Amino acid sequence: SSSVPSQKTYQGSYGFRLGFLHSGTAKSVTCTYSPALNKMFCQLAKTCPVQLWVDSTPPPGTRVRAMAIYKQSQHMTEVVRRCPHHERCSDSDGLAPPQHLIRVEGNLRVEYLDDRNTFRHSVVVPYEPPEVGSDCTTIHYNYMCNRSCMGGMNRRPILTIITLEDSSGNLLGRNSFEVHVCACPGRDRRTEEENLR
Ligand SMILES: [Zn+2]
Numbered sequence: 001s002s003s004v005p006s007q008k009t010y011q012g013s014y015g016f017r018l019g020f021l022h023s024g025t026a027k028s029v030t031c032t033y034s035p036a037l038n039k040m041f042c043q044l045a046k047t048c049p050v051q052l053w054v055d056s057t058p059p060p061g062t063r064v065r066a067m068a069i070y071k072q073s074q075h076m077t078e079v080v081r082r083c084p085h086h087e088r089c090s091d092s093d094g095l096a097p098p099q100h101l102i103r104v105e106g107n108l109r110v111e112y113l114d115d116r117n118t119f120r121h122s123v124v125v126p127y128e129p130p131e132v133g134s135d136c137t138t139i140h141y142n143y144m145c146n147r148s149c150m151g152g153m154n155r156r157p158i159l160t161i162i163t164l165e166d167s168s169g170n171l172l173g174r175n176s177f178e179v180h181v182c183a184c185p186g187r188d189r190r191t192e193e194e195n196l197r
Contacts, residue, residue, distance in 0.1 A: 002077035003077070003118045003120075004069070004076045004077055005067055005069055005118075005120060005161055006161075006174065007069060007159060007161050007174075007176045008174065009174065009175055009176070010171070010173055010174040010175075011173055011175075012164065012171070012172050012173035012174075013056075013172065013173075014054045014055060014056050014057070014058045014164065014172060014173060015053075015054055015055025015056065016052070016053070016054055016164050016172065016173030016174075016175065017052075017053040017054075017175065018050060018051065018052065018053070018162060018175045018177060019050075019051035019052075019053050019136055020033035020040065020049070020050065020051060020177075021033070021049055021051075024186070025185075025186040025187070025189045025190040025193075026186050027184060027186050027187060028186070029185055029186040030042070030043055030046050030047065030185070031043060031046065031047070031048050031049070031185050032185045032186055032189050033177075034189050034192070034193060036193060036196060037178065037192060037193070038177050038178055039177065039178040039179070039180055039189075039192070040160075040177055040178070040179050040180070041180045041182060041185035041186075041188050041189045042143060042179065042180070042181055042182075042185055043146075043181065043182070043183070043185060044143065044144070044145070044146045044181060045142050045143075045144055046142065047105060047140045047141075047142065048140065048141045048142065048143060048179075049138050049139070049140055049141075050138070050139050050140075050141055050160075050162065050177075051136040051137065051138050051139075052064065052127070052136060052137040052138075052139065052162075052164075053135065053136045054137075054164075054173075057129060058127060058164060058166070058172055059166055059167070060167070061126075061166065061167030062126070062127035062164060062165070062166055062167065062172065063124050063125065063126055063127055063164075063165050063166075063167070064124065064125050064126075064127050064139065064162065064163070064164060064165075065122050065123070065124040065162070065163040065165060066102050066104075066122060066123050066124075066139075066141060066160055066161070066162055066163075067102075067120055067121070067122040067123075067160070067161045067163070068080035068101050068102055068121075068158050068159065068160055068161075068179070069158065069159050069161060070156055070157070070158055070159075071156070071157040071158055071159050071178060072156060072157065075156055079119050079120055079121065080101055080121070080152075080153065080158055081099050081100070081101060081121060081152055082098065082099050082100065082101055082144055082145050082149075082152050083145050083149040083150060083151040083152030083153070083154070084151050084152070085149065085150065085151070086098075086144060086145050086149065086152070087099050091144075095110055095112065096110075096112055096123075096144075097112055097114065097121070099121065100112060100121045100123065100144070101121065101143060101144055101145055101152075101153075101158075102121070102122075102123050102141055102142070102143060102144070102160065103123060103141065103142040103143075103144060104123050104125055104139060104140065104141060104142070105140040105141070105142050106140050107125050107139070107140075109125055109126050110123060110124070110125050111123070111124045111125070112124075123141075124165075125139065127164065141160075143179060143181045145181065146181040146182055146183070147180065147181055147182055148182075148183070157178060157180070158178070158179055159176050159177065159178050159179065160176060160177055160178075160179050161174065161175075161176045162174070162175050162176065162177075
């Protein structure tokens with residue numbers, strides 16, 4: 001058996017889009033997003049801000065789900081999970097399953113799912129509208145393995161799929177971005193952009 005979650009962009013009725021801080025590539029940055037590569041460069045277990053931008057307010061009870069998938073075609077059917085080492089280092093925050101790559105930081109309403117049919121992991125929070133004078137909603141994700149992990153991702157590129165779903169789980173919108181968890185995001189981003197013709 002196997003299945004592959006859709007990664008098709010779907011802005012949907014509420015005009016759902018993702019946004020990221022314009023953080024630059026100084027060596028000290030804790031994370032940084034490349035618009036040219038649609039790629040977020042971030043660090044193990046550290047804050048990774050992702051912004052939700054909507055054009056109109058979704059219904060009450062809307063939820064925001066994050067799920068990782070392998071980028072390379074030949075690995076798409078493989079569930080992305082933490083490496084054995086990090087799983088064993090028993091470092092759950094008391095909410096997150098130790099096998100889950102993606103956590104949410106700073107939200108006590110976070111919910112984690114092991115899908116009993118597809119075996120995929122995901123993390124979901126209630127959708128909240130922006131604060132007054134803010135134009136987006138920010139979620140702090142943490143990625144709990146990097147590209148230096150042996151086993152688990154094992155150096156392979158991944159994407160995060162962000163889904164807006166209603167209270168009944170129906171699809172309202174979907175977006176995605178590549179994630180590269182590394183030691184020095186600023187350096188990795190600048191280097192990877194240096195190639196661009
Ligand atoms: Zn790991």
